[PDB]
From a paper:
The [name]-[name] [name] protein is a viral accessory protein that functions as an innate immune inhibitor and strongly localizes to the nucleus, despite virus replication occurring exclusively within the cytoplasmic compartment. The [name]-[name] [name] protein has been shown to bind preferentially to the nuclear import adapter [name]α3 in infected cells, thereby inhibiting NF-κB-dependent innate immune responses. Our results provide a detailed structural basis that explains how a virus can target the [name]α nuclear import adapter to impair immunity, and illustrate how small mutations in [name], like those found in closely related coronaviruses such as HKU5, change the [name]α binding mechanism.
Because the results indicated that [name]-[name] [name] NLS was able to bind [name]α isoforms with high affinity and showed little preference for a specific isoform, we examined the molecular interface with two [name]α isoforms using high-resolution structural approaches. Specifically, we crystallized the [name]-[name] [name] NLS bound to both [name]α2 and [name]α3 and resolved the structures to 2.1 Å and 2.5 Å resolution respectively. Our high-resolution crystal structures showed that [name]-[name] [name] occupies an extensive interface across both [name]α2 and [name]α3. Strikingly, the binding interface of both structures lacked a Lys at the P2 position within the major site that is seen with other NLSs. Surprisingly, [name] [name] does not contain a Lys at the P2 site, but rather a Val (position 35), which did not form any interactions with the Gly150, Thr155, and Asp192 pocket. Rather, [name] [name] bound [name]α2 and [name]α3 through an Arg residue (position 33, the equivalent of the P0 position) at this site and formed similar interactions to those made by a Lys NZ nitrogen at the P2 site.
Residue numbers in the entry:
A (entry chain B): 22 to 29, 33 to 39
B (entry chain A): 72 to 442, 469 to 486
């Protein structure tokens, strides 16, 4: 049957 | 000079307070290990949140938004502290400022806040961020501001449990349809990752994405010049084909399988394995879709990967072959055996992965019929009893 992808905080600083 | 900075920031001399705020911004916007925790302990948060409300001093507002943005770039606890300071509503209000810098920095800070977790995401959504965020979508926007907006959209779509509200999904998808036609590689990558996250949620979300009418723009990007775009689009279409056969056929109607020879022969084993995973999900569908896969001449490459590829790609190829054997007609299984699949499909039987071993055994048993774990030994015995004996 159909299978889903395996399980795998995006913050960005300003410099 | 952290506490002197704090006290000077709590001043009504605009010069002194702005100097202290930009000094704190410098401290927090340079060294890889910034003094976020100590500046929080010194009580800079309420002062900065207060400064955000000073519409008469736009540069003070901007520098405070900068400092809070970088404070929210630390630990989850520090982002939650920023949230507790009552900074989100003031950012939401400054989105409508007559000066573009405060607006863009507020978008940045709200993106950092939303990216922390689904609960903060839902709070910022409840306060109504999506409409003013997407109002900035215009041809006259600078690409930097548009990149930040697209990154915020990705953050909004990212989290799975709980998934984003259906109404926010509905508002975001049209903007993704507008942005999928952009030249900027960063914008395109962000858009594709966002709709990938949306397609990883569920079948009704997949159906909404299909209703938007963007899948035919997504499929071509499988052959985009940029590997990042290619990988994002590959995972997105993979998610979509994990749903119903109807949605899988919608994906296949955009001539998607034409893009997969290059992905199967790509030097990157991660691209290889994701492509083989897509093709396994396709082989787990209708016999007509199995026939389509066979016609695209991808089966020999799948078998070559099963034979000599990375072990993860080998597992995914075993899955694809087994799904084809159980969901394929006798002529298609005959084609498979004609393409010399038995030796490599058998060599995997020695691996430790019980799942892949059982998949191989099941494929072999079903092929023969068409012609530790209890589940494994039982199949080994059943196959041996029927075919060995």
């Amino acid at each position: 049957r159909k299978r889903s992808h395996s399980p795998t905080r995006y913050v960005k600083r300003r410099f | 000079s952290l506490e002197a900075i704090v006290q000077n920031a709590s001043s009504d001399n605009q010069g002194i307070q702005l100097s202290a705020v930009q000094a704190a911004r410098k401290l927090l916007s340079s060294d890889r290990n910034p003094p976020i925790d100590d500046l929080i302990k010194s009580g800079i948060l309420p002062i900065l949140v207060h400064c955000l409300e000073r519409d008469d001093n736009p540069s003070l507002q901007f520098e405070a938004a900068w400092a809070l943005t970088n404070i929210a770039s630390g630990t989850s606890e520090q982002t939650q502290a920023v949230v507790q300071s009552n900074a989100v509503p003031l950012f939401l209000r400054l989105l409508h400022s007559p000066h573009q810098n405060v607006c863009e920095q507020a978008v940045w800070a709200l993106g950092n806040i939303i990216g922390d977790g689904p609960q903060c995401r839902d709070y910022v959504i409840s306060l109504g961020v999506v409409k003013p965020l997407l109002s900035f979508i215009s041809p006259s926007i600078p690409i930097t501001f548009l990149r930040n907006v697209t990154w915020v959209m990705v953050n909004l779509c990212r989290h799975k449990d709980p998934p984003p509200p259906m109404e926010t999904i509905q508002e975001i998808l049209p903007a993704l349809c507008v942005l999928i036609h952009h030249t900027d590689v960063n914008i395109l990558v962000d858009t594709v990752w966002a709709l990938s996250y949306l397609t990883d949620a569920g079948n009704e979300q997949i159906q909404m994405v299909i209703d938007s009418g963007i899948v035919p723009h997504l499929v071509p990007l499988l052959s985009h010049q940029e590997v990042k775009v290619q990988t994002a689009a590959l995972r997105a279409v993979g998610n979509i084909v994990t749903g119903t056969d109807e949605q899988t056929q919608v994906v296949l109607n955009c001539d998607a399988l034409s893009h997969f020879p290059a992905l199967l022969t790509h030097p990157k084993e991660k691209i290889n394995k994701e492509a083989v995973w897509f093709l396994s999900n396709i082989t787990a569908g209708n016999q007509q879709q199995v026939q389509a896969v066979i016609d695209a001449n991808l089966v020999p490459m799948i078998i070559h990967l099963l034979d000599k590829g990375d072990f993860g790609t080998q597992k995914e190829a075993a899955w694809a072959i087994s799904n084809l054997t159980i969901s394929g007609r006798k002529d298609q299984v005959a084609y498979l055996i004609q393409q010399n699949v038995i030796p490599p499909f058998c060599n995997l039987l020695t691996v430790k992965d019980a799942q892949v071993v059982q998949v191989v055994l099941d494929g072999l048993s079903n092929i023969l019929k068409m012609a530790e774990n209890e589940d494994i030994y039982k199949l080994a015995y059943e196959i041996i009893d029927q075919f060995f004996s």
